[PDB]
Design a protein around this nucleic acid. Structure first.
Ligand SMILES: [Zn+2]
Ligand SMILES: [Zn+2]
Lengths: 114, 115
DNA sequence: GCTCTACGTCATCA
DNA sequence: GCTCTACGTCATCA
């Protein structure tokens, strides 16, 4: 049978990482490696990775899971991205983590400015 | 025999102001009164009246005529609004002609700030 | 640790 | 004297 690609043991994949994000990763290894598998909100993606609404709303660029807004089911749907995908785009976009941290550096000066 | 609201004489209305802007006015009168009947582009509307893309897109708030973009037919469509509508909305929004003039005054001063 | 949008300008590109 | 979008923050509101 096919095996979790992190641990090489488990045969029962995490239903969400599997069905939605297309990753053969079991549940236990999703927890044990949040640097890869942690589901972040759309706002977490904007602020941590400086991704813009036009790239987060590309259907053809990220998988997503959509959830009712925990604040109210009449507010816009919660969207959830798997961290390795957004990270992997964000590292192209800004040229690696070195380059990412420099844009963090750049905007915080902007606040001292204001 | 319905008559032109401007001249009170012609029976034949300008087909565009009639069909599209729902105005009972003749070609000759639209011409003589640009202050009421001139068709303005979407971009003329933003420059001159400080209306915004969200207002000008409201299907339920202005009539519009659409023509192919005169620069290229591959480009986004030209959108044409009638000056009585536009000016009317903008006067409500900016508190009259005087208020629209103040707003003008304010955005010139945004450029004197950015030298 | 929720999201959309609109402000605001302008530059592109279309 | 053509149009949209994006790039900016946020705030507000949904
Ligand atoms: Zn595993
Ligand atoms: Zn007439």
């Amino acid at each position: 049978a096919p095996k979790c690609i992190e641990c090489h043991i488990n045969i029962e994949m995490d239903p969400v990482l599997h069905d939605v994000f297309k990753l053969q990763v079991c549940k236990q290894c999703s927890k044990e490696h949040p640097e890869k598998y942690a589901l972040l909100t759309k706002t977490e993606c904007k602020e941590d990775y400086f991704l813009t609404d036009p790239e987060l709303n590309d259907e053809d660029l990220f998988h997503r899971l959509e959830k009712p807004n925990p604040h109210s089911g009449t507010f816009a749907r919660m969207q959830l991205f798997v961290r390795c995908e957004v990270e992997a785009f964000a590292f192209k976009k800004w040229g690696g983590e070195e380059g990412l941290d420099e844009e963090w550096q750049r905007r915080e000066e902007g606040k001292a400015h204001r």
